[PDB]
Design a binder for these strands. Structure first.
Ligand SMILES: CCOCCOCCOCCO
Length: 132
DNA sequence: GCGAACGCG
DNA sequence: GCGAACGCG
């Protein structure tokens, strides 16, 4: 069950696809540790993907040993694969999110990390803390 | 809508 | 064995 000294992340979208953001919070406190400026077009899974990787980079900067919780099978897998498999068309209106996703892929393939990435078990625990 | 997890040849 | 037909915001 829950490791409380941990960071939780979640994505939110106005439309899917649409404007997406994300945040990370302290799983115990609910303290908002970071939040990303709105991105004009993205998907839920892209947003999540950026969120996990932001967290990874947040924690590593700080030499944290805390784990990250995510409720996304997909984003978790993409992170473990160091490869994002989004179906989102690449055009003028999606270049920003795709630049962001590629760079985070790049980061994952050019760096190591200690952080355990753990499934937030929603049926048992409720809404992950980082939900909007 | 996003992406992962039965029937054919 | 291969390809078509859940959890979360
Ligand atoms: C300026 C406060 O430091 C925040 C550290 O987080 C850095 C995250 O880097 C961007 C990851 O995509």
């Amino acid at each position: 069950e829950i490791i409380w000294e941990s960071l939780s992340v979640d994505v939110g979208s106005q439309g899917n696809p649409g404007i997406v953001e994300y945040k990370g919070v302290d799983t115990k406190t609910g303290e908002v540790l970071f939040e990303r400026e709105p991105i004009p077009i993205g998907t839920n899974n892209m947003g999540e993907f950026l969120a996990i990787v932001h967290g990874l980079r947040y924690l590593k900067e700080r030499n944290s040993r805390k784990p990250i919780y995510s409720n996304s099978q997909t984003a978790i897998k993409w992170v473990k694969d160091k490869k994002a498999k989004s179906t989102l068309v690449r055009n003028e209106e999606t270049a920003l999110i795709w630049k962001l996703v590629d760079e985070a892929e790049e980061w994952l393939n050019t760096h190591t990390y200690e952080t355990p990435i753990l499934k937030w078990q929603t049926d048992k625990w409720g809404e992950i803390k980082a939900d909007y």
